[PDB]
């Protein structure tokens, strides 16, 4: 049994909140909701699609119909911000089955632009044979960036690395990128190039040997 | 009032094998189904099985069956799981959830159950890997304002820590996520923005400590 939840959501201090959790006749199925913030361990909100925990606030509420059930979330505060898994119970296979998970963003702060810097092979790790292209962009708002290398304009995939955006002291955001390339690739081009995208925008800077 | 406490979980090689334990408290243990999920590093929750109040039903989920064992000691407050024949794949974190056990009672019509987890542990870590302990290799990433910072990589296991000039300068640094290699070895980065105006005045000195090795490296950081 498959559960389709959506990636992320977005919405403002204020404003409620949506999030599809849907399957075949789910009506028939008990859904229920969790919600698990960055690092603490999971929490349920709301069970048997209707019913809720006492602790959890009026602004919590359960539907389920058709082909997909919601949860629905007003009123939103900032303490609000977490992922959200809808799960339910299998009778053909006994499974329990979760969803892919959605992650709110309560927006309160000024969207911002990446700062992308480009760091080519150090000096010494040269010497040690190796080659290490590091992309590093930052203070960007909202977290959720795109990056693509690319050598001589021709498009590069093999032997690529990203970390995941991670909020930074002054609450933006900053993501990390690397290329691994033997000495003698990084003689033989010409230039490498790592490439940004943000929202539509793509901030790019190139170094070459 | 109610908690759970896992543990157990430590350092795998694929192959090898691992019993964790959970233990409980603040409640009838007795009354009550258990559970066992995992959810790979930023990934998704994901179940493994599952056992009634007393061991009438437990069910595997389709991945880990034919690997994996779970059981209870209800004498004991405890909850245990056998893990076999194990995969990198299986290399997550570990949560013991709890159950209130609903269901509608039908002698003639069907026994149906309901589950739905309403108390979570913290859990446990668990890594399979087959690399070996080592310490990281630091080269310097040197440069109105300008960046520089280490380039700690190839190490293993978890975790690294970094500092600079002794902890004395905060303001402006962001200690990165390690991403994981192709072979298996982790590595990460340590940049601090500063004033390119105070540059040739001040010393940037990059404090590494990687504890799973007893390493130290120490490498200042200047223009070229």
């Known amino acids: 049994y498959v559960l389709t939840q959506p990636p992320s959501v977005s919405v403002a201090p204020g404003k409620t909140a949506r999030i599809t959790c849907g399957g075949n006749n789910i009506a028939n199925k008990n859904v229920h909701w969790y919600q698990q913030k960055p690092g603490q361990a999971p929490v349920l909100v709301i069970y048997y699609d209707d019913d809720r925990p006492s602790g959890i606030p009026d602004r919590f509420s359960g539907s389920n119909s058709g082909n997909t059930a919601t949860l629905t979330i007003s009123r939103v505060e900032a303490g609000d911000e977490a992922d959200y898994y809808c799960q339910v119970w299998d009778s053909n296979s006994d499974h329990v089955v979760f969803g892919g998970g959605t992650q709110l963003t309560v927006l309160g702060q000024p969207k911002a632009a990446p700062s992308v810097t480009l760091f080519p092979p150090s000096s010494e790790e040269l010497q040690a044979n190796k080659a290490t292209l590091v992309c590093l962009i930052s203070d960007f708002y909202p977290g959720a960036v795109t990056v693509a290398w690319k050598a001589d304009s021709s498009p590069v995939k093999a032997g690529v690395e990203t970390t995941t955006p991670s909020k930074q002291s002054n609450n933006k955001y900053a993501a990390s990128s690397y290329l691994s390339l033997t000495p003698e690739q990084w003689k033989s081009h010409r230039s490498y190039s790592c490439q940004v995208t943000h929202e539509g925008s793509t901030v790019e800077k190139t170094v070459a040997p | 009032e109610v908690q759970l406490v896992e543990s157990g979980g430590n350092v795998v090689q694929p192959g090898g094998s691992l019993r964790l334990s959970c233990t409980a408290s603040?409640?009838?243990?007795?009354?009550?189904?258990m559970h066992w999920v995992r959810q790979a590093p930023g990934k998704g929750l994901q179940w493994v099985s599952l056992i009634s109040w007393n061991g009438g039903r437990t069910y595997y989920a389709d991945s880990v069956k034919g690997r994996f064992t779970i059981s209870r000691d209800n004498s004991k407050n405890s909850l245990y799981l056998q893990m076999n024949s194990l995969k990198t794949e299986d290399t997550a974190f570990y949560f013991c959830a709890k159950d209130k056990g609903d269901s509608d009672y039908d002698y003639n019509l069907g026994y149906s159950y309901f589950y739905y987890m309403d108390g979570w542990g913290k859990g446990t870590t668990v890594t399979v890997s087959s690399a070996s302990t080592k310490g990281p290799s630091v080269f310097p990433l040197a440069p109105g304002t300008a960046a520089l910072g280490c380039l700690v990589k190839d190490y293993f296991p978890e975790p690294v820590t970094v500092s600079w000039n002794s902890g004395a300068l905060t303001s402006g640094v962001h200690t990165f996520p390690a991403v994981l290699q192709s072979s298996g070895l982790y590595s990460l980065s340590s940049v601090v923005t500063v004033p390119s105006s105070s540059l040739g005045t001040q010393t940037y000195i990059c404090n590494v400590n990687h504890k799973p090795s007893n390493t130290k490296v120490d490498k200042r950081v200047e223009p070229k």
């Open positions: 603040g409640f009838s243990f007795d009354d009550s189904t």
